[PDB]
Design a protein around this ligand. Structure first.
Ligand SMILES: *[C@@H]1O[C@H](CO)[C@@H](O[C@@H]2O[C@H](CO)[C@@H](O)[C@H](O)[C@H]2NC(C)=O)[C@H](O)[C@H]1NC(C)=O
Ligand SMILES: *[C@@H]1O[C@H](CO)[C@@H](O)[C@H](O)[C@H]1NC(C)=O
Ligand SMILES: *[C@@H]1O[C@H](CO)[C@@H](O)[C@H](O)[C@H]1NC(C)=O
Ligand SMILES: *[C@@H]1O[C@H](CO)[C@@H](O)[C@H](O)[C@H]1NC(C)=O
Ligand SMILES: *[C@@H]1O[C@H](CO)[C@@H](O)[C@H](O)[C@H]1NC(C)=O
Length: 915
């Protein structure tokens, strides 16, 4: 094995060659020199974090003022209209006419004029009614609703006309009947119950400490167990994240069905765990209600755990019996703080008297489930039963509640919904009320798209590493870069998108209560692509949103504290000029409302240049965005004309490129244009951000086993961010790039580590353990894969000796047959350039010396061949591994710190609760 000095000399020579070639061919010096030479065409302006967060908070509060005023208006007029309703029965003569969606033209037929802000056909003349497929059409229980909701369309018209930015307006009733205003055909045996939706549920009840008990007696084993499992699973589905639920089973003794021994939050992971636990249940023993309910009661009074002190409930899943257990209820529940809802599931002939008495005495309700199908309807009922204190609150239940981000029904994007319920309370001066008013007519809601929220968020004046994020008092994120749809509400915690520490949890527990401040901390950050980790200083500025429960914050790496502007060409952005200017891509952003994104990019180029070409004033068009993009295109053209033209063809350099802020890309030769595979949006490509954060050269490895050839003829991507100093103040405008022919690198790698023999291994890796160069001539075919997938022993020993530190993220968005993805990414932790040791699997030992490449992220390892002694502990894989995330059995006993809503309505003295 060669000496350490020889390996150091080889590393120095290789790193000098690579660095020099990348620097000379990419042309960082010329670009930065141009940027520092003009100082005229651009303006550097401060990006005030606290000011921006305040402006965004007030703006979003105003948009919520819009969408709450609309809702109070619609609800008030709904109450007024139904209050003075005849309840016409004989609708034979009075044929009511309405526009039913999802219908067919086989014997209203609107022209269906398509407008912006909606992807599909809309008609503002009429409103569209959605009814569940299972429920029946025109009858004595739907036609009345279809009549008295015919006056809601006027309010819809008025609301839209007074505010043209409204997205959607819906009203949900006790029998479905979603009447949504911008009448659009439905999806295209579709299942959608309006009452079975988070926005319906969150408005129709209060945050509840639900408990579940299941009758698991051996005598009722069979189909009843399956019905119980499916019913309780659908119950858990009904539970939102504002409620705490736990399931226990009792058979002469009560025990937890799962690893949880207390009330846990009803989030997706816990809900799945409870569902799986109940699905694993089996029936054995004799029933004893007393000890079951007792246990449920100290679980209710279990104040040692996290709870929303609000709306305590028991939900018993029984069949029938002759045991009322008066004394058990009397001992624990004398003031009657706990509701008890009991079920009679299955078809049997047991006595149901005590079962009904339990609900009757404890202010709960009793339900029967004779067969599959009635579970969906029966589940909605207890929520409306819980609304009795809420309906009797009067001028206190009038408070809109904003849902979390969830996918819209007609495929519009990420949206949240407002909620308000409608009552029949009327005539306060006489009070013929205190009646049927107990029940609600349903809930009505408006929608705001996350595109609308992000229109209030100007991200393009920041760096790609900066962004916005807002968090609700539960703890999840309302808006985040990593918040991406999968196709169910999307749920990302603040410490589930970013990387966890003590400072981030401290600030997520310091602004979730609704405080403000600033804090700069030194941590490690994550790249756009799930392959690399990085490190940098980020400052977080946060302020509460006074109008709502939300809390927004802003992030700034300490080089995007300032930004760039432009004070106050055509030939550059011409496809026919690509022969000399290179195959340009333009970033499909909202440059102008007149044009649209194309993704095509070629067409987008035609549209962009035809709009820019023709007076060029553009009276209804953006100003700063187009100005910056023009200036940046000028810069890219200047670079290509001055430097890249001089050396038309380099043996080792397959291509060159420069991506910038503004969205202009330049690949010098024509043939390399079709080799370009990445996103034209410069805020979306990973390497842009990675290079800005790393102060060294960044070698992006190509993908391995990717569809279509992209390794041999594409080359190796190298980058280095451009940093400028105007008046001693930092900014990171652009990054440059090169494609390195693999053949040239191979031929120059044979100068030391000669090939065609199996004696020693010479491989060059980067951050993340991706193979870039190898001598074996069979590893060089497979360039671009994770190095642990070919030599896992070496990577594991490298991890143990602490040259590669990894921490795993858990991303909950995946395509699987809502799996959790284990996101492993590696990086250098110990800033030690030299590393040596012996890799021994037993008697056989291999001497290795690993020396890092200076001013890059590459590592060269000089280890013996695998033929000397076989050793493979396990094939270590770095990819999106499908596996269970962190165990919730341990994270519920020390969960994330929550703040609950102070607004609750329960234990009302005026409450009737006759049933
Ligand atoms: C609030 O809603 C209920 C639901 O319809 C109304 O109950 C109806 O009351 C009328 C009174 O004449 C009866 O004719 C109907 O038969 C009732 N409905 C049902 C389903 O039986 C109630 O009247 C409403 N409250 C007010 C103040 O009108
Ligand atoms: C909110 O309401 C006002 C009053 O009509 C309206 O002009 C405004 O555009 C709405 N939206 C926002 C974001 O303020
Ligand atoms: C609803 O019923 C009333 C009778 O109270 C009738 O006059 C009215 O026209 C009906 N509405 C529609 C849309 O026809
Ligand atoms: C990130 O990696 C460091 C070093 O390996 C480790 O100390 C830290 O706990 C990791 N962070 C997370 C959130 O796992
Ligand atoms: C864009 O549309 C034009 C229309 O003629 C077509 O020629 C071109 O190939 C398209 N490019 C892409 C990438 O879709």
């Amino acid at each position: 094995f060669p000496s350490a000095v020889t390996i150091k000399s080889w590393v120095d020579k290789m790193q000098e060659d690579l660095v020099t070639l990348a620097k000379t061919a990419s042309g960082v010096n010329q670009l930065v020199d141009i940027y520092e030479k003009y100082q005229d065409l651009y303006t550097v302006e401060p990006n005030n974090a606290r000011q921006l967060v305040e402006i965004a908070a007030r703006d979003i509060e105003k948009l919520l003022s819009n969408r709450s005023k609309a809702l109070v208006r619609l609800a008030l007029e709904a109450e007024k209209v139904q209050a003075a309703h005849q309840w016409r029965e004989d609708f034979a003569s009075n044929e009511v006419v309405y526009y039913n969606a999802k219908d067919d033209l086989d014997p209203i037929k609107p022209v269906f004029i398509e407008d912006a802000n909606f992807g599909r056909q809309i008609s503002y003349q009429h409103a569209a009614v959605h009814i569940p497929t299972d429920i029946y059409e025109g009858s004595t229980i739907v036609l009345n609703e279809l009549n008295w909701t015919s006056a809601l369309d006027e309010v819809f018209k008025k609301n839209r006309e007074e505010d043209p930015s409204l997205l959607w307006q819906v009203f949900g009733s006790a029998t479905g009947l979603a009447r949504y205003y911008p009448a659009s055909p439905w999806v295209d045996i579709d299942l959608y119950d309006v009452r079975r939706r988070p926005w319906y549920i969150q408005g129709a009840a209060s945050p509840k400490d639900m408990l579940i008990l299941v009758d698991v007696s051996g005598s009722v084993s069979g189909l009843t167990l399956k019905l119980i499992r499916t019913s309780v699973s659908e119950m858990l589905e009904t539970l939102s994240d504002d409620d705490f639920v736990n399931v226990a089973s009792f058979n002469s003794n009560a025990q937890d069905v799962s690893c949880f021994q207390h009330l846990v939050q009803a989030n997706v992971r816990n809900k799945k765990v409870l569902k799986d636990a109940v699905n694993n249940i089996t029936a054995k023993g004799i029933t004893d209600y007393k000890k079951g309910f007792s246990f449920a009661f100290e679980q209710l009074l279990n104040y040692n755990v996290s709870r929303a002190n609000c709306n305590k409930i028991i939900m018993l899943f029984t069949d029938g019996g002759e045991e009322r257990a008066q004394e058990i209820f009397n001992k624990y529940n004398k003031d009657k703080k706990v509701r008890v809802f009991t079920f009679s599931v299955g078809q049997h002939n047991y006595d149901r008297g005590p079962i009904q008495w339990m609900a009757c005495e404890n202010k709960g309700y009793y339900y029967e489930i004779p067969s599959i199908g009635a579970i969906r309807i029966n589940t909605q009922e207890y929520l409306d039963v819980l609304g009795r204190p809420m309906v009797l609150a009067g001028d206190k239940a009038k408070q809109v509640q904003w849902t979390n981000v969830y996918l819209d029904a007609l495929e519009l994007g990420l949206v949240i919904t407002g909620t308000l319920p409608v009552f029949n309370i009327t005539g306060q001066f006489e009070n013929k009320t205190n009646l049927k008013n107990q029940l609600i007519l349903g809930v009505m809601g408006v929608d705001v798209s996350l595109e609308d929220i992000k229109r209030l968020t100007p991200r393009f004046t920041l760096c790609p590493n900066g962004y916005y994020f807002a968090i609700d008092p539960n703890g999840y994120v309302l808006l985040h870069p990593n918040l991406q749809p999968k196709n169910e509400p999307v749920t990302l915690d603040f410490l589930d998108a970013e990387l966890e520490n003590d400072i981030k949890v401290e600030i997520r527990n310091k602004m979730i209560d609704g405080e403000s401040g600033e804090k700069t901390f030194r941590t490690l950050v994550k790249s756009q692509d799930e392959r690399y980790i990085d490190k940098g200083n980020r400052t977080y500025t946060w302020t509460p949103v006074n109008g709502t429960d939300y809390s927004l914050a802003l992030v700034l790496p300490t080089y995007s504290f300032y930004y760039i502007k432009a004070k106050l060409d055509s030939e550059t952005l011409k496809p026919d000029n690509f022969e000399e200017s290179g195959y340009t891509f333009i970033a499909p952003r909202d440059y102008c409302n007149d044009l649209k994104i194309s993704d095509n990019n070629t067409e987008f180029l035609l549209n962009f240049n035809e709009f820019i070409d023709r007076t060029p004033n553009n009276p209804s068009c953006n100003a700063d965005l187009i100005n910056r993009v023009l200036l940046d295109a000028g810069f890219t053209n200047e670079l290509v004309q001055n430097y890249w033209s001089k050396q038309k063809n380099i043996k080792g350099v397959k291509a060159r490129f420069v991506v910038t802020d503004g969205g202009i890309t330049r690949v010098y030769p024509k043939e390399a244009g079709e080799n370009w595979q990445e996103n034209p949006e410069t805020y979306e490509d990973s390497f842009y951000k990675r290079s800005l954060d790393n102060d060294n050269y960044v070698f992006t490895a190509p993908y391995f086993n990717k569809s279509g050839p992209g390794a041999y003829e594409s080359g190796i991507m190298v980058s280095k961010a451009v940093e400028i100093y105007i008046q001693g103040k930092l900014l990171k405008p652009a990054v440059v790039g090169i494609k390195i022919d693999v053949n040239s690198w191979i031929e120059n790698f044979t100068k030391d580590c000669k090939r065609n023999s199996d004696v020693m291994d010479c491989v060059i890796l980067d951050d993340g353990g991706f193979l870039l160069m190898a001598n074996h001539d069979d590893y060089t075919n497979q360039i671009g894969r994770f190095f642990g997938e070919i030599d896992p022993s070496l990577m594991r020993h490298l991890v143990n000796i602490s040259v590669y530190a990894f921490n795993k993220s858990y991303d909950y968005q995946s395509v699987c047959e809502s799996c959790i993805t284990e996101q492993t990414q590696y990086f250098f932790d110990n800033d030690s350039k030299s590393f040596s040791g012996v890799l021994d699997c037993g008697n056989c030992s291999r001497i290795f010396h690993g020396e890092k490449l200076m001013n890059t992220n590459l590592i060269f390892i000089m280890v013996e061949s695998k033929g000397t002694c076989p050793c493979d502990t396990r094939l270590l894989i770095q990819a999106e591994q499908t596996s269970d995330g962190p165990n919730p059995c341990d994270m519920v006993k020390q969960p994330r710190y929550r703040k609950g809503p102070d607004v609750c309505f329960d234990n009302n003295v005026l409450e009737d609760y006759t049933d």
